[PDB]
Amino acid sequence: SKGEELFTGVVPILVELDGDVNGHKFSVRGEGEGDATNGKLTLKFICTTGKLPVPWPTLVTTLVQCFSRYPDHMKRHDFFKSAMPEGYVQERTISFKDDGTYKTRAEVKFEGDTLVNRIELKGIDFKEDGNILGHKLEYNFNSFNVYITADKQKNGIKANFKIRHNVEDGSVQLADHYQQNTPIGDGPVLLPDNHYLSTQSVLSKDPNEKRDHMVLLEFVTAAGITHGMD
């Protein structure tokens, strides 16, 4: 790509999310930076409307897979960077087992030198005293493999995967993710062979921050392609 060239160094990131879950309206803003060469990013998120009405871990996947490290032998399979700078639309349905559903639409693109993720999230049918609206989820995350496939009649990619959030009573809350990404612009993109993204996330708190917030460190490497060396 020349989309690839845009990620050779450290890139500033801005994330803005506008949310509505059972009529609770909220906003989140995140800032930090990404380094695709090492598949690493660092971000701090603030709930700008006050107290966040859902648990922070439930928003992680919604809150820039263009910062994945693709190994050399797999560069031909990186849709996310090939869509830059014009970007891509990322849509999900996140279905919480025995509870509500989030639907998300985001545009991920450059605005000047900053990579921007701008999201709208709508959440419906949540149980007012279930694990989500009742804040019964632990503050932690885990590592996941996200399987990527080429959209079979169209010009983007797809992914489905399960996130498992720990609940405070020792159980797990499932969040089944269905994802589609499609380019904003018109010019050629890379359509990948089947592979996956090996993802790891660590959450923390800033001892000096008294707003409702999440600090996040993430490492993401692509894997699972046998051919393309030398």
Residue numbers in the entry: 2 to 64, 68 to 234
Sentences from the paper on this structure:
We have used superfolder GFP (sfGFP) as a model system to exemplify and understand mechanism of action of these two different nnPTM routes. SfGFP26 is an intrinsically fluorescent protein derived from the original Aequorea victoria GFP. H148 plays an important role in defining the fluorescence properties of GFP through the contribution of the imidazole side chain to the charge transfer network that modulates chromophore protonation state equilibrium, and maintaining local structural integrity. We have demonstrated the versatility of genetically encoded phenyl azide chemistry to positively switch protein function through two different non-native PTM events: photolysis and bioorthogonal modification.
Replacement of H148 with azF results in a ∼90 nm blue shift in the major absorbance peak to the less favourable 400 nm, indicative of the chromophore (Cro) ground state equilibrium being dominated by protonated (neutral) form. The likely explanation for the absence of N2 is that the azide moiety accesses multiple conformations through rotation but we cannot rule out loss of N2 during X-ray bombardment during data collection. The H148azF mutation removes two H-bonds from the Cro hydroxyl group to: (1) the original 148 imidazole and; (2) the OH side chain of T203. Both these H-bonds are key to Cro deprotonation in the ground state, so their removal promotes the neutral phenol form. The structure suggests T203 side chain rotates so that the hydroxyl group is further from Cro (4.8 Å versus 2.7 Å in sfGFP) and poorly orientated to H-bond to Cro. There is also a shift in the position of the loop housing residue 148, bringing it closer to the adjacent β-strand 6 resulting in the expulsion of a water molecule. WB is observed at a similar position in other GFP variants (e.g. EGFP,43,46 the S65T GFP variant and YFP41) but absent in sfGFP148azF, with the nearest water molecule ∼7.5 Å away. The loop housing residue 148 shifts on substitution of His for azF, with one of the main consequences being closure of solvent channel and breaking the water interactions network through to the chromophore; it is narrower in sfGFP148azF with only a single water observed in the channel. Visual inspection and analysis using CAVER52 shows that the channel and water interaction network is similar in terms of pathway, width and residue positioning in original sfGFP, sfGFP148azF+1 and irradiated sfGFP148azF (c and S11†). The equivalent features are absent in dark state sfGFP148azF.
